[PDB]
Amino acid sequence: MIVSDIEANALLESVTKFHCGVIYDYSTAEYVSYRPSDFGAYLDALEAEVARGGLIVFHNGHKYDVPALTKLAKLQLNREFHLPRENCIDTLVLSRLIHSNLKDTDMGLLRSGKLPGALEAWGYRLGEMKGEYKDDFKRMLEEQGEEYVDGMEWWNFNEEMMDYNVQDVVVTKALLEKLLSDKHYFPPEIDFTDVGYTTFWSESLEAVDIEHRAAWLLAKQERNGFPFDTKAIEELYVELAARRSELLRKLTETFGSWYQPKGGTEMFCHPRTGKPLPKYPRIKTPKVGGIFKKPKNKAQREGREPCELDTREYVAGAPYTPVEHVVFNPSSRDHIQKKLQEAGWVPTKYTDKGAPVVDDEVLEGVRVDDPEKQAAIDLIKEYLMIQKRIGQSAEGDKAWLRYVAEDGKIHGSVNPNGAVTGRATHAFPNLAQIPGVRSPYGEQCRAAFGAEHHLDGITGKPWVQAGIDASGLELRCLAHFMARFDNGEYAHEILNGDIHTKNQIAAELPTRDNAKTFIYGFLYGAGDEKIGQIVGAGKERGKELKKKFLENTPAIAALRESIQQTLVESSQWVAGEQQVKWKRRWIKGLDGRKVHVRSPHAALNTLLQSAGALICKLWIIKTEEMLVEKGLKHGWDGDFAYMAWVHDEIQVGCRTEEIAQVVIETAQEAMRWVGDHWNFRCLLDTEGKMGPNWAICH
């Protein structure tokens, strides 16, 4: 087993030079440094470990180092280099599995101070190396008089870089050993730093194998990217911007501008009593300036001539209140609230901080006598929505337009095990929160992401898209876990036609979507009122619905009790929280991992969401594996390409309709394989759609 890390001149997208590398071999118990001209030797050392049936450990190598080396090897040495997946270990992947209850900076992309909870020390260190290196580099320069530029610390190799490269490996080695010491994932009787790769995967908890296969596959998806229609979104941006302008124009005509105090430093005090009046706006008492200027001659200084006027504008001792001119901002809940109360609106609900609540719910309910302002409310709602679309598509820091790469695709990032339950998180930009086709502007947004927007490298023919989504996944998970209480009764009923459509009807809900947000809110503990809000009624309708669905399948109560009995010993509320005494504060996931439980109440959600998450994870893995065994190649220079994984759905680009048909059929085979693999008590299914883009494939 060896531990390694590299230093290159840029992120994967544009890296073109290997600066250095370090390798720690467990067999020799020694570190070896490779400088820029030692690149070939470095690569040879990695392949020697592979040929030996050994293992290579990197910290974030799955997403960076491994692919980076393949790229650099081709550019610099015109060499083919491809470390096999089974020979690689990623301490970041391991750390995100074992310490899943914790957050991380995603390797310095997120400011540590903005994250909640604690951070694993070694990982924190590794994640901050680039930042600390840059700081070191920057001061050294300023100690030499030379200026600092953009990010010159990565343009050339230097010995500080080398030392850091070395530090990474020693820290990564410590992290590795810290993770390997967890008896839950790694059996104590085996020294995992001294076994071949086959032993490493087979002797460790299944979860370890699943996480690494997920990370390796998802890294590839990131490299593939999602074909994006830049032109269509820019045109949408224009249309949205125009609509926003018109709304602003009308709204600013309806709601006039006003002045607010701003810039005041001194406290205003009663001129008679001298009592400070904190509630009055801060003021400013100029210390210089008078009505006239200082006398510049005899009979001026002797009060005989006029004496020059002080054009200034202030007078010493004459206090005033500094103000600013503010224009109505439809995006300011504060401005909306101000103008509406000034119109007679009497706020009913406020935030747990005093401010009145101004969401779409209350806006829709607001009533004022002036018909023009009453009408302005709709304009405000539309404006707020237009902003969300504009922000997500063009103006936000994470806007799609700011992320489109040269290859005409958006390479969204994925943290394979970013959520506590085992789900992935998505960001930069979050491809898992694209507006749905049924919401305003949804179709345009959705259609902009699609295989059609990718022209084949050889024929120039647009690719086709295969969308597959697990059918009512979390409800089937529920059926599985409560089969021991109802003998698979629900597991059989759920297959009788679409479960959500069935519920929609029984609940008398408008849409199948509403039924979903209803059943899950219900299943996971929403209150009577919370349910009422979801269906559009009150706490009254809430109770009816909850009792009607709980009556239908009382086993839900049974499952909820056993989970409680298993996790909780006793609990009680102190003030604004419920202090709990735990028997065990984690659930054993489907693949054996510990799944941290945040609260006794969210427990059932932890159990079911985790199960669905691990099922889908194994699902995308087996699916790609079954395709590869069928001779299909994964890539734009091949037959298919993973473009996105959104919890229980995958969107895959295919070179032909035939392949898309096979991707869809294979996905279904893989899901059934997963179900059989974990002896699931509920049959698992998927629904697939072939089409040009995401609007049609979901």
Partner: protein, 105 residues
């Protein structure tokens, strides 16, 4: 004896008043504005004949002030034939106001 202005009457009462008009831009929520208010009432009398004192509440009339770049209140603008003759910001005293007025009238 003071003239209470509105945005719509500002043009004719001030810009076309032909004579010296002292406009006070104020707001009910300003400490200094409440201070100078009584001073203005007395000034209105004394200077009756050679000066007209008008007030414009910037809250009730949000359209005029902006045109004059109001940055602080109370703001005292002295108009003469539609032109701003002199400007002064702050709660001046009875004496200081008189001084300011006599020097510009």
């Amino acid at each position: 004896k003071i003239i209470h202005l509105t945005d719509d009457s500002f043009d004719t009462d001030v810009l076309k008043a032909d004579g010296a008009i002292l406009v006070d831009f104020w707001a009910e929520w300003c400490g200094p504005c409440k201070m100078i208010a009584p001073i203005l009432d007395e000034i209105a009398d004394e200077y009756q004949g050679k000066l007209t004192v008008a007030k414009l509440n910037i809250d009730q009339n949000p359209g005029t002030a902006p045109k004059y770049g109001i940055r602080g209140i109370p703001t005292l603008l002295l108009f003469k034939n539609g032109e701003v003759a002199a400007t002064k910001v702050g709660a001046l005293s009875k004496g200081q106001l008189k001084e300011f007025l006599d020097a510009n009238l």
